[PDB]
Amino acid sequence: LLNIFDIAGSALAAQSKRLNVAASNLANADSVTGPDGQPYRAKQVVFQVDAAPGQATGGVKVASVIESQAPEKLVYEPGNPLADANGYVKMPNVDVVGEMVNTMSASRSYQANIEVLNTVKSMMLKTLTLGQ
Amino acid sequence: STVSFAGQLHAALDRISDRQAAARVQAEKFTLGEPGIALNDVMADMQKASVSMQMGIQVRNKLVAAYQEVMSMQV
Amino acid sequence: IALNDVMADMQKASVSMQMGIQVRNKLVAAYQEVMSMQV
Amino acid sequence: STVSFAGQLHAALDRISDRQAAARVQAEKFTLGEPGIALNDVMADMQKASVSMQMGIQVRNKLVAAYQEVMSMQV
Amino acid sequence: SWSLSVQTLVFITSLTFLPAILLMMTSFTRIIIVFGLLRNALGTPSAPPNQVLLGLALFLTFFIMSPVIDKIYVDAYQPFSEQKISMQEALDKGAQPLRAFMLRQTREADLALFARLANSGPLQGPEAVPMRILLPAYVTSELKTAFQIGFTIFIPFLIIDLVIASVLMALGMMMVPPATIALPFKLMLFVLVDGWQLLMGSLAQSFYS
Amino acid sequence: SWSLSVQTLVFITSLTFLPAILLMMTSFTRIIIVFGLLRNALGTPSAPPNQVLLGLALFLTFFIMSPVIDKIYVDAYQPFSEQKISMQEALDKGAQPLRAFMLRQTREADLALFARLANSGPLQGPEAVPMRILLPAYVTSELKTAFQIGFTIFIPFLIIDLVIASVLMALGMMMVPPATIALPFKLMLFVLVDGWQLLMGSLAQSFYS
Amino acid sequence: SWSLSVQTLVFITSLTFLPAILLMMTSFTRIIIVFGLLRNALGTPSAPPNQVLLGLALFLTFFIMSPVIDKIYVDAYQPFSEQKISMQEALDKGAQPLRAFMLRQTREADLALFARLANSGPLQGPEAVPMRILLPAYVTSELKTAFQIGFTIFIPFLIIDLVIASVLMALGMMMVPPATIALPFKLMLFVLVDGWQLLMGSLAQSFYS
Amino acid sequence: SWSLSVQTLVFITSLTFLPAILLMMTSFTRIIIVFGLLRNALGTPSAPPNQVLLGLALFLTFFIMSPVIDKIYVDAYQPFSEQKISMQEALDKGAQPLRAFMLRQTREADLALFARLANSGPLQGPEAVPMRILLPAYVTSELKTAFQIGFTIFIPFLIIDLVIASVLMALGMMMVPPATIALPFKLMLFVLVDGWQLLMGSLAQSFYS
Amino acid sequence: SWSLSVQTLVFITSLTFLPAILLMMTSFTRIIIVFGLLRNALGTPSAPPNQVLLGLALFLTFFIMSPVIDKIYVDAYQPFSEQKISMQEALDKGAQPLRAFMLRQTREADLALFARLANSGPLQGPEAVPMRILLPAYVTSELKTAFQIGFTIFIPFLIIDLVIASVLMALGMMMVPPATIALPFKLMLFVLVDGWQLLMGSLAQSFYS
Amino acid sequence: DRLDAALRFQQEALNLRAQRQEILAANIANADTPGYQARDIDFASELKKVMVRGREETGGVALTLTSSHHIPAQAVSSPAVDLLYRVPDQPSLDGNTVDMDRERTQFADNSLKYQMGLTVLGSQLKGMMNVLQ
Amino acid sequence: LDAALRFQQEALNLRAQRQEILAANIANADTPGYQARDIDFASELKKVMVRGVALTLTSSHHIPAQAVDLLYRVPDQPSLDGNTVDMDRERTQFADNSLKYQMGLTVLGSQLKGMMNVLQ
Amino acid sequence: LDAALRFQQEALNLRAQRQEILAANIANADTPGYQARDIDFASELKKVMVRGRVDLLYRVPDQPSLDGNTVDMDRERTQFADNSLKYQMGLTVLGSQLKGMMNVLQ
Amino acid sequence: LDAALRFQQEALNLRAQRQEILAANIANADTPGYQARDIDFASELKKVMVRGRGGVALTLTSSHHIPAAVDLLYRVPDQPSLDGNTVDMDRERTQFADNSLKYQMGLTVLGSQLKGMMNVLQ
Fold first, then answer.
1. Sign of torsion, CA L11 L12 L17 L19?
2. How many CA atoms, within 13 angstroms, populate the side-chain half-sphere of residue K103?
3. C39 CA to chain F: closest CA distance, Å?
4. Closest C-alpha among L46, E73, E159 to residue F184
5. CB K9 within 8 A of CB B44
6. Residues of chain K with C-beta less than 8 angstroms from the C-beta of A10
């Protein structure tokens, strides 16, 4: 895999994973329970630069998805199970505006990397006609 | 020493051959996936080797024509 | 059969036939040059 | 029994012609309104027929070049 | 080694140098000169050189170089086929038998002249002389030998000419053209003793000795 | 300088002009004309023109030119190899030794004629004659020298022809064809004297004296 | 004017028509025919055709044409440098010195032939003749001049052959090939006279007087 | 009519058929054959075939065919330019003078042979001959005429050869080669008669009788 | 069938094979060989091969094959055009006429050789021979017939050589070169006898007997 | 020979590129089938394996070659290359581990490198033909 | 000789490397604290035209192993996540660099084809 | 000759002129009292073929407006689209003739 | 010779400069008090064709001493704006489209002439 295709493809993968996390947040906002019974903790991705040994630059890797540890806004329904003493359901802490902006920006970055890939592919296929 | 037409010609043909060999090794390593080598390097060196080949061919044609013209005159 | 295989075969055979014909041309020319001298 | 490679060329030409004729009759049937035949099937078969025809044209070009070269050896 | 480039340049160009350089490198010079000289005796051509004499010399030199070609074949065409010998030791191994063949026929003072005018320094041994010096020396030596053989061949036909002319003029034939009388006598001498086999065998024997 | 265009353009044209102008500009004219005239004597051709005398003449001219070509090499090919000389000073640096060589053989008066038919003004020294004057003067002088060597070569075989003819007449050979009688004696004379060695040596020693 | 199309389209085709029309419209016909006839005298080739006689002729005719080419340069090339002239008046400007030269060389009655057979009208002066009538006239007159020179060339070697044959005949030499003895004397007469300089110079002088 | 389709498709192919068919349809068969035969006489080639004789024949054929070319011009080209004629009427308009010209030169018996072996039915007049019949018949007649001229040209040089040989061996010069003595006399005879004018004028005037 | 599919690929390759096979499979080998041999006699070529002999042979072979071409046209092209025949029975419909023509011309012993080496069994009738056998037999027979004709054409011109040489030797014209004297006599031998018409007519007659 | 020993490497590499090409297009074609488990191959290791060993394609048998009119038919054949699983990101509830972006960037890369191989073979063969004329 | 093609060749090569650098900037246009990098073409090209180490290289079977200045891009509009990739700047630079790569390809094509035309 | 391209060349020139006229129509679609114009393509083409190197007829109006303006925009839009399409057709036809003439030639 | 290509070439080059000038307008469509510039194409092109494209190289001695025109008119505005800016967009828009089209036309003409010479040569 040529280096520049690898860089832009890693960008594409990272953007797809970021958009997926944003969609999962925006979809499970207002979700009382998980499988076992616990709040849905809002999810974020971690972007880090790739190619750690060598040139210190190139590509983006989204290893280690993490959780946004904000204090998980509460509501009061003291007849609902999943409510502790001081009946307080846990109610995922997803901020819809932030997630919508994340989706928009991720789509735009995805487009930019796709279209870098197209430009580079044309560049290389033209290089193959060097001379002849 | 002396101009050594045989030795000089041998050295020139060796230069042609090793330029071709260097280009071929580079292309081999590029298509095998070995990192490093860039695509433009491959194409440029391949074309350079081709131009060296063509120059050698033209020199050969001119020398062969010269030899066959000299070795045909009636004495 | 693979298509790239078919064209590589095409070209290999074409080059081989060209080389054989050129070698025969050189040999025939040498024969005639030897046979056209004075004795 | 025997191969008689002129027979092999005849077989190749018959294959190319039959494939093109099949694609043509499929386009015939589809534009005629015959149910069944799909558009993507029509286009795919036309594509394959085009590739086979260019196969035949390239073989033609190289056979003509080969014959024009074997008629150049001096005897 | 060479790389699908130069190989099939040096080969096709070597085939180009074949008819002149390689044929006059080995033999077919002595034989052709001797055949032409024999044709000067016995009168007219009567042997179509473009058709017969050149081909006879070609066959004779094939026979003559059968040993050197056999040794070349053993030293190169076995090893050089697919393994362990690649166009550098092949070249010197295949040069050795031809070079010994030429050195074995070269007059020992031709090489002297061609070294003394190529400004070559000391030549250590017989193997130290290069092809540069070996070619013209071999050609000059072979010309000398061809003229010697032709002279010996001229001896008996000259004898027949003079004896026939003497007989004609002594018996009173004042002014007859003895050449036309002598020509069939030349044929008779040349065929009764089975002359062609003697000539080709003597050449073949003397060519390597 | 030039930029790998006209370089490798003038190179290929130089190669094309090589066989005719360069060879008939350096040597191999005197040698080949003297070989042709020696072939005129000794009877028939009896040595193949298109291969052997041409090859021997090429080898003789290479050996004679080796000092000239070595000077050209040390003055161009090293200093033209990438540094301070690129096929503009290469041309004149290489021409000067060849020009001196050709001047050393030109007849003193051929230069005069070709200068006087160029309307060239006065010339100061041998460095002032241009290649335009120097080619045809050298060619004409070479033809004269070749014909002089031709005399020196015809002399002894003319002696043999005449002495054989005189013996044959005095003896009473009415009309024996003395040419066939004298041809083997011509070959004999040319082989005992060791004529090929000493002839090529004489040409060489003549050619730069 | 023309526009770097048809200009540079007439140029390349002019260079195509060069080797025949231009080398056989100026000189090099008389010179080469005299050289070939001279070579028929003195026996064998004795000068390689395609190389030394042809090259020497090319040099010589360049030397005769240098004044006409100088005038053609002054009247075409210098003004054709961007200014007041581009291949329309330039054509006859460059023709006029050449036409003057050819007229000055043509027979005064070959023009008559090639004019009367062209149905051409009555001519006022030399300037009114067209290139059309001028070419074949110049070629035919030049062939006549070449054959006259050739006859004069054959004179003295004819003298030598006759005197040699007569001496042999008086001495009683019934059957000696007088050409063999006479050939070195032919070269004799051709070198002591210093024949190459004289002939080259006399051709040049005859060519303009 | 044709529409810059087939037009300029038949023009380019017309030009490719030009050099052989058209130049061997009109003249330049007779002229070239006569010059070649003339050149066998007068000794060696001694005239640059592919240089002077071909060009002279081209000019001669231009002049001979000029009335035909003018009639074709006036009857075909200008009427073909823009108005009432387009490449079918043009064909007979341009052929009629050419067909008449070839008829006037054909043997009156070659047409018979080719018409009878082409199964052609009875021919009403000179205008009923088809081009298919008239081409090869004209070629055969032209070959006959050229060989007739050739013998008639050979005659006087045969006279010179035979008289020189008779005088030589009558005087006792038994075996001096008469060709070598004769060649200057051949050139002398052909230059005193002003041979080139007589030849080319007679060829031209024969070619319309 | 094929549908403007591989058709017009097979057609264009058929046009490619036209010049070589279809002019070396029908006629034009015998005629062209006879013309070449005829030029071998009559001394020098002096007939422009690339144009006149080739053109005459091509016209003569067209006139010969007008019946065969007519039958192939009538039984293939008219039916192959749009209806009931298309490149499947077109081949045999066009081959039968050519086969009949080729069989009528074959020497009866060549078919024997090529059937005995192709390992084919006994052949009942004239038709039983296939193309794979018919072609080499036809070319061998055509060569045989062409050389029989050509050497019978030589014989009279060598008779002329004989008579002229013997007369010159009888008169004692020692070494007058009888070829030069014979050449004009060969030419009138070939024109008084009405040579070209008789030759073309005999070839056309022989080519269907 | 020695014509198909110098051109052997690029021929084998280009055929392997075509084989990886239909592997990747099988990935693309099964984009939305459930439980597909996208496949791929290692090009460098497989190319070294091809050069050292040969082709040795595993699994395939055609019918016999008796007198004509015996309806040729063939079994299902597959190259000896060992298909490797592509390590997935983003689980998707239906087992389908075909990520459009990964498969598609690999498709474009493989296409470009196949074109490069075609260029290299074309150059070598043009060189051969330029020597011989 | 035939290193007269060197300049453009190396120049072209340098442009390609630049692309990667610029491409990385686009890929990491969202990561926090990337600090967009770039190189200056003119000085880098001059330095490379003016101008890893060799290991144990006796006969084979000893496993040979092989061993630019990335300058900050001074930013504008600080963004609180350390990312200094002003994507607009990088888009403009990428377009221009792709264009100049095409120009270099055309120049090598022209020099090589001139060389080949002289040679036939 | 080489007047075999004359018909389409003059047709394409007249098409360009009609484009200019219709663009002027669109531009003056608001100026009071404009009295939209046009040319008859067929008649003008025949007139330029018979003689060589154009009266501005008045487009007959519908739907009065009290500003005198008679550019009825819908008709002008359709005619402008038609003229542009016919111009592109003329380009293709001339291109095909020139392609053919230069294909036969080399 | 080979100055036939000069005219078109100059035109092409001048077109490029105008693009820059025009581009400046677009880039300064809102900067206050800009006073849009433009050049008169015909007069500047004729001036270049008459004379050409002033500078002097450094000392003409040996190396190691390291030796080494279009008047911008003002666009008459319409619609004043109390920031001085006289770049009226629409005019710049149409000018940019026209300049791009005529630059392409110059490229086509120059390419046709170069192709003509190359076709004649080969």
1. positive
2. 8
3. 6
4. E159
5. yes
6. 27
